[PDB]
Design a protein around this ligand. Sequence first.
Ligand SMILES: *[C@@H](C)C1=C(C)[C@@H](CC2=N/C(=C\c3[nH]c(C[C@@H]4NC(=O)C(C)=C4[C@@H](*)C)c(C)c3CCC(=O)O)C(CCC(=O)O)=C2C)NC1=O
Ligand SMILES: *[C@@H](C)C1=C(C)[C@@H](CC2=N/C(=C\c3[nH]c(C[C@@H]4NC(=O)C(C)=C4[C@@H](*)C)c(C)c3CCC(=O)O)C(CCC(=O)O)=C2C)NC1=O
Ligand SMILES: *[C@@H](C)[C@H]1/C(=C/c2[nH]c(/C=C3N=C(/C=C4\NC(=O)C(CC)=C4C)C(C)=C\3CCC(=O)O)c(CCC(=O)O)c2C)NC(=O)[C@@H]1C
Ligand SMILES: *[C@@H](C)[C@H]1/C(=C/c2[nH]c(/C=C3N=C(/C=C4\NC(=O)C(CC)=C4C)C(C)=C\3CCC(=O)O)c(CCC(=O)O)c2C)NC(=O)[C@@H]1C
Ligand SMILES: *[C@@H](C)[C@H]1/C(=C/c2[nH]c(/C=C3N=C(/C=C4\NC(=O)C(CC)=C4C)C(C)=C\3CCC(=O)O)c(CCC(=O)O)c2C)NC(=O)[C@@H]1C
Ligand SMILES: *[C@@H](C)[C@H]1/C(=C/c2[nH]c(/C=C3N=C(/C=C4\NC(=O)C(CC)=C4C)C(C)=C\3CCC(=O)O)c(CCC(=O)O)c2C)NC(=O)[C@@H]1C
Ligand SMILES: *[C@@H](C)[C@H]1/C(=C/c2[nH]c(/C=C3N=C(/C=C4\NC(=O)C(CC)=C4C)C(C)=C\3CCC(=O)O)c(CCC(=O)O)c2C)NC(=O)[C@H]1C
Ligand SMILES: *[C@@H](C)[C@H]1/C(=C/c2[nH]c(/C=C3N=C(/C=C4\NC(=O)C(CC)=C4C)C(C)=C\3CCC(=O)O)c(CCC(=O)O)c2C)NC(=O)[C@H]1C
Ligand SMILES: *[C@H](C)[C@H]1/C(=C/c2[nH]c(/C=C3N=C(/C=C4\NC(=O)C(CC)=C4C)C(C)=C\3CCC(=O)O)c(CCC(=O)O)c2C)NC(=O)[C@@H]1C
Ligand SMILES: *[C@H](C)[C@H]1/C(=C/c2[nH]c(/C=C3N=C(/C=C4\NC(=O)C(CC)=C4C)C(C)=C\3CCC(=O)O)c(CCC(=O)O)c2C)NC(=O)[C@@H]1C
Lengths: 164, 164, 6, 5, 177, 177
Amino acid sequence: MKSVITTVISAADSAGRFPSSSDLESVQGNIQRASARLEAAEKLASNHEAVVKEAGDACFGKYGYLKNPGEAGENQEKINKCYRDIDHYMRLVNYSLVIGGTGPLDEWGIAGAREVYRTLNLPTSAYIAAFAFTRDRLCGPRDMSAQAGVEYSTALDYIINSLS
Amino acid sequence: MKSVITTVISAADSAGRFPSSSDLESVQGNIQRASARLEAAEKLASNHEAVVKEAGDACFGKYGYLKNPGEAGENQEKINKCYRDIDHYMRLVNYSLVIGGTGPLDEWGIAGAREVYRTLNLPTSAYIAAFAFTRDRLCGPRDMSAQAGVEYSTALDYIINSLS
Amino acid sequence: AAFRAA
Amino acid sequence: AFRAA
Amino acid sequence: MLDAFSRVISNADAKAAYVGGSDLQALRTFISDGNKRLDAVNYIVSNSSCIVSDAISGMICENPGLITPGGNCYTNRRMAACLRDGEIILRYISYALLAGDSSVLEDRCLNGLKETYIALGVPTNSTVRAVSIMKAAVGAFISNTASQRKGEVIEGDCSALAAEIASYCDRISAAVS
Amino acid sequence: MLDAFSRVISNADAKAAYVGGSDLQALRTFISDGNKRLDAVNYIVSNSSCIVSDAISGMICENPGLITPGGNCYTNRRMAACLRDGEIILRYISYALLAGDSSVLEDRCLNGLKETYIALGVPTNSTVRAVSIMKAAVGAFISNTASQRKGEVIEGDCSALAAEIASYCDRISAAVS
Ligand SMILES: *[C@@H](C)C1=C(C)[C@@H](CC2=N/C(=C\c3[nH]c(C[C@@H]4NC(=O)C(C)=C4[C@@H](*)C)c(C)c3CCC(=O)O)C(CCC(=O)O)=C2C)NC1=O
Ligand SMILES: *[C@@H](C)C1=C(C)[C@@H](CC2=N/C(=C\c3[nH]c(C[C@@H]4NC(=O)C(C)=C4[C@@H](*)C)c(C)c3CCC(=O)O)C(CCC(=O)O)=C2C)NC1=O
Ligand SMILES: *[C@@H](C)[C@H]1/C(=C/c2[nH]c(/C=C3N=C(/C=C4\NC(=O)C(CC)=C4C)C(C)=C\3CCC(=O)O)c(CCC(=O)O)c2C)NC(=O)[C@@H]1C
Ligand SMILES: *[C@@H](C)[C@H]1/C(=C/c2[nH]c(/C=C3N=C(/C=C4\NC(=O)C(CC)=C4C)C(C)=C\3CCC(=O)O)c(CCC(=O)O)c2C)NC(=O)[C@@H]1C
Ligand SMILES: *[C@@H](C)[C@H]1/C(=C/c2[nH]c(/C=C3N=C(/C=C4\NC(=O)C(CC)=C4C)C(C)=C\3CCC(=O)O)c(CCC(=O)O)c2C)NC(=O)[C@@H]1C
Ligand SMILES: *[C@@H](C)[C@H]1/C(=C/c2[nH]c(/C=C3N=C(/C=C4\NC(=O)C(CC)=C4C)C(C)=C\3CCC(=O)O)c(CCC(=O)O)c2C)NC(=O)[C@@H]1C
Ligand SMILES: *[C@@H](C)[C@H]1/C(=C/c2[nH]c(/C=C3N=C(/C=C4\NC(=O)C(CC)=C4C)C(C)=C\3CCC(=O)O)c(CCC(=O)O)c2C)NC(=O)[C@H]1C
Ligand SMILES: *[C@@H](C)[C@H]1/C(=C/c2[nH]c(/C=C3N=C(/C=C4\NC(=O)C(CC)=C4C)C(C)=C\3CCC(=O)O)c(CCC(=O)O)c2C)NC(=O)[C@H]1C
Ligand SMILES: *[C@H](C)[C@H]1/C(=C/c2[nH]c(/C=C3N=C(/C=C4\NC(=O)C(CC)=C4C)C(C)=C\3CCC(=O)O)c(CCC(=O)O)c2C)NC(=O)[C@@H]1C
Ligand SMILES: *[C@H](C)[C@H]1/C(=C/c2[nH]c(/C=C3N=C(/C=C4\NC(=O)C(CC)=C4C)C(C)=C\3CCC(=O)O)c(CCC(=O)O)c2C)NC(=O)[C@@H]1C
């Protein structure tokens, strides 16, 4: 899992050096920013089922054609899988917020996705529509702190760039 | 020059990645810790000639044999070069404190040191003793703030382990 | 590798 | 020898 | 590579001078305003897909000859390579913005780009256009004045950073020119 | 490699459950006590030389049979490899202390170490002693109770850190044993 520590320790292991100043200083960035992203993490865990339905909803509202036969949402079953993945992504987002890095999303969600979604005929724009809605639905003070929203949108923006 | 930024950008370039959370979060460490190391840095610049005489003295005060013929301090020439190196080191200490990493010391001070001092017959303990005194000379409240004496001592401990 | 030579 | 052994 | 702080050390080493107040001042503001810097950099990496696609696309809509039999953007393989080059350039721009130095963009990107483009036959004049549009988008996403992207970061002054990122975009255009 | 945070994510993924209170609390404490940790790691990398030379040296003064024709520390080349191994071991331990996880010490160090020693004829029993003194030296430099080294860090409780670093030392011996 890619984080502040894992990056700094891997850089040092490659150079055969003990942890030094920029290594300890890099983690001081940890101790400062944990609060923000850790807030957003609990916000997801506490209410992710309303976030996925909302995201899942907007998606099929934008692409109603998917409820056609030979499509990706031709039956409630495949429909259930759509919201299910949306929840996977959101759950890995929470992971990335707790880790403070993009590792959980990187290895558990983004690696192989393109091959999988192309091979399995799942339109990428639908996923992006689900995560664009989720990002913009965010309400600054209401839902989380200001810097927590930054970490929320940053993560969601990351997922979007990966699918475009 | 190795720093928090230089490391974080080097780790991302190696994987062809845009800067991400763990990268922006690591620099939040700079913005927290820069102040401290920036303090001691100006402490060195403001009084580096007094600190080096003290360091130089202890060195030759501990090891009188260096003032012997065929030695490293047999004449004021070689002696003056001793105090000069101490200053070079002390100046790279200032550099590393401003960089927030060990870059300056590593490339300009430690690389090749091994070969140079053996080839020129310069006792490593004479170097170590100069920086061990300098490190222990530091007085917690009197000379600098606590965390400024930390980067100061970390830096000196760094040079010491590099010589041993 | 065309970045190297050129 | 760390790999092989 | 260097960043804001080690670039000062380099110039002070040339004089064999410790770093003091005068030079410490500027580095202290770097810290001071450092959170705006982190934000600006994010505005780039946050819309980097749109910034490259819109710019590579723009450079073509103004020059259809690029996607024409004989044009350097003709075939999927040339288009994809150009989009890729646009993505790498903007990434090295984003690196330089994070470090407060161009040492990394010119050491690892612009070093041998032009000559490489000459060999490959890549139109440098056109490339400078994609780079120019990327400058505008980037400039827009940094100041938060993005026509389509509108975030809620606390208001302030980011003209020094914008003038700073623009300068990096300019060293690219000047480099392959 | 994992750290304290990705370690919980791994364990929470197994149940496909977001991370909540139970698991968030402890990681919140990691942060709070986080400044103690950076010192803890620094206490190691600051005396990394003395701990290694003292431990390799101690293991030999108690077993002089090592520097004997037939001992694994006989010749300069075997001494230098053993000092180097102690340094490498103390380095990976320091890594796991900065991360709050043993994944990095076992994945990149203790992964095939003993079996490696089997082949070379490196005495695992003696190595387990060297590690034991390093654990003692390390444990002392963290608590600031070092017989010779006395630093000025603001007083507090570092027994969880001491107990954690000892555990890492224990998985080293446990691996080559
Ligand atoms: C011909 C088809 C052609 C294209 C596609 C144009 C390109 C172009 N855009 C310029 C500026 C620019 N583009 C963006 C990106 C953008 N807007 C968003 O908010 C989102 C999201 C996207 C990505 C897709 C930005 C932010 C800007 C600035 C203003 C804006 O529309 O928001 C640009 C101007 C270059 C210059 O001033 O030097 C051009 C030419 N237009 C075409 O002609
Ligand atoms: C026989 C020649 C021999 C040696 C060299 C001994 C080894 C030994 N060290 C023990 C404890 C220990 N080592 C250090 C390091 C050390 N002391 C200093 O303060 C400085 C600085 C150095 C580095 C050189 C320390 C700090 C410790 C931990 C306790 C302490 O001394 O404050 C050790 C005991 C291990 C144990 O009981 O598990 C051994 C055997 N002693 C010799 O026999
Ligand atoms: C739109 C961006 C422009 C375009 C681009 C284009 N370039 C390539 C090929 C190459 N460009 C590079 C340079 C980069 N790769 C990197 O490693 C770096 C960063 C360190 C950069 C910026 C190189 C190495 C090549 C040669 C090999 C390749 O296929 O990748 C292509 C392909 C050219 C060809 O036909 O083989 C093209 C078309 N051309 C346009 O019209 C634009 C203005
Ligand atoms: C031009 C760049 C934009 C701008 C920004 C601006 N933000 C701040 C202050 C803060 N921004 C951060 C965010 C970061 N710090 C980090 O560690 C990371 C991790 C990913 C980032 C992106 C933080 C936490 C602050 C503190 C206060 C707050 O929550 O916003 C300022 C304040 C002034 C300053 O830092 O000197 C400003 C002005 N203003 C804009 O409108 C721009 C488009
Ligand atoms: C005191 C420490 C003990 C000692 C050591 C000793 N080991 C070697 C050589 C090797 N041991 C390793 C293992 C390590 N290298 C690593 O990279 C890692 C971490 C990822 C470890 C812990 C390996 C690869 C070797 C073989 C080749 C090499 O020098 O790199 C030697 C040399 C053995 C020989 O005589 O050829 C010895 C003597 N022996 C003692 O007595 C100790 C208890
Ligand atoms: C057992 C480990 C020792 C101990 C330590 C201890 N540390 C503090 C608090 C601080 N120490 C730091 C220093 C670091 N943080 C970093 O970012 C880095 C960068 C290189 C280091 C080395 C700082 C800034 C703090 C915060 C408060 C202060 O200035 O001292 C404490 C206080 C309690 C806390 O959790 O903050 C503790 C207990 N206590 C000892 O007695 C040990 C031997
Ligand atoms: C602030 C900009 C504006 C605002 C917003 C508003 N949003 C809702 C309701 C929801 N928004 C979300 C999103 C989140 N909930 C969370 O748990 C999280 C963190 C993971 C976020 C980002 C959800 C779950 C809902 C639906 C359920 C609800 O709580 O009622 C509403 C409801 C109105 C509607 O559905 O259109 C509004 C009003 N209100 C303001 O004052 C704005 C300026
Ligand atoms: C407290 C831990 C101990 C203490 C110290 C002591 N300090 C001095 C005088 C000097 N200290 C230094 C060291 C530095 N000055 C700096 O500029 C820097 C940063 C680069 C450091 C680390 C120097 C230069 C001196 C000599 C000149 C001076 O008076 O300023 C003194 C004077 C006593 C002496 O010279 O013998 C003391 C008392 N004394 C304690 O009680 C300690 C435990
Ligand atoms: C919602 C926008 C889209 C949708 C989805 C859809 N999902 C699949 C199948 C898969 N989904 C995944 C992706 C994930 N699962 C995970 O393990 C992870 C990370 C831990 C992710 C994000 C995978 C791997 C597959 C293949 C395996 C399986 O079928 O589950 C399907 C099933 C297709 C079918 O039954 O043939 C569907 C349809 N449907 C929509 O309309 C969307 C565009
Ligand atoms: C002081 C404890 C010791 C001492 C020193 C001594 N230095 C040299 C020669 C050199 N020392 C250096 C090292 C530095 N110069 C640098 O440029 C840097 C980093 C920027 C450092 C720290 C170098 C490169 C040399 C060679 C060139 C030159 O002579 O300066 C000597 C010369 C000895 C000889 O016979 O040539 C001296 C005397 N003398 C002491 O007593 C010490 C043990």
